[PDB]
Amino acid sequence: IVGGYTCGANTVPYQVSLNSGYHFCGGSLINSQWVVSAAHCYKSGIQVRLGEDNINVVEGNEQFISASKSIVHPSYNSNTLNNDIMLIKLKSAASLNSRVASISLPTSCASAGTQCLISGWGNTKSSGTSYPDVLKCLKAPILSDSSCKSAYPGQITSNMFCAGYLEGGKDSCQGDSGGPVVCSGKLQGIVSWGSGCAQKNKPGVYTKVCNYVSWIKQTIASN
Numbered sequence: 001i002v003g004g005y006t007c008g009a010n011t012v013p014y015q016v017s018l019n020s021g022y023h024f025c026g027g028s029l030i031n032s033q034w035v036v037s038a039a040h041c042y043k044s045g046i047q048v049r050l051g052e053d054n055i056n057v058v059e060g061n062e063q064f065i066s067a068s069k070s071i072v073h074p075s076y077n078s079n080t081l082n083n084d085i086m087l088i089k090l091k092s093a094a095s096l097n098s099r100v101a102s103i104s105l106p107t108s109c110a111s112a113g114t115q116c117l118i119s120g121w122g123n124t125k126s127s128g129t130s131y132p133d134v135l136k137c138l139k140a141p142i143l144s145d146s147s148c149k150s151a152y153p154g155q156i157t158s159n160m161f162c163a164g165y166l167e168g169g170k171d172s173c174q175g176d177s178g179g180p181v182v183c184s185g186k187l188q189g190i191v192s193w194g195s196g197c198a199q200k201n202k203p204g205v206y207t208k209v210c211n212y213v214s215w216i217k218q219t220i221a222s223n
């Protein structure tokens, strides 16, 4: 996250870190046994780490559970990043409490102008690299789909939306991939892509989770 603030330990209880020997992507817990993340974060051998704040120090609220199945969206296209979303089932259910909790799926798509909370342990600089150990947060509006499409001509599909600031300065970034965009207490987006980070006229682009709710519910019902 570039230009955000330190969230505070366990203030984002649905935030997950995906670990394969190191943190490589975020995710969101959507019930005690399932995590949603970005399909471009797919790897075999994922361990899901819940209840995290400092990812390099064991602080006492963590649950580390390995994945039993990963399901990338059937129409994920890695060239266009259309349908960048995947479901991860945990080997055993997480114990849910105030510090480890799930986030609700949306019943409606959020509109442009709604302020949302994006969080993750990704890069905090638009030039150079510095990865934080504690979770960073950013409040950002969803942008109109015409300003999103003017920023990225020919690249925005109906399963994507832009959120951020067209003047740059504040944005999600590499390592934030797969993490949550929450608006009005519902999961509305998944950190997906963008050109650089926090650059002028290049806002972050996010998977539009309200288009996938029937696919998620159906897949969790049968797996």
Ligand SMILES: N=C(N)c1ccc(NC(=O)Nc2ccc(Cl)cc2)cc1
Residues within 6 Å of the ligand: 040, 078, 081, 171, 172, 173, 174, 175, 176, 177, 191, 192, 193, 194, 195, 196, 197, 198, 203, 204, 205
């Ligand atoms: N500006 C951002 N919000 C931003 C920019 C880039 C990323 N990350 C990626 O674009 N990562 C990535 C995308 C596709 C593939 Cl195939 C591999 C990595 C995340 C957020």
Ligand SMILES: [Ca+2]
Residues within 6 Å of the ligand: 052, 053, 054, 055, 056, 057, 058, 059, 062
């Ligand atoms: Ca920790």
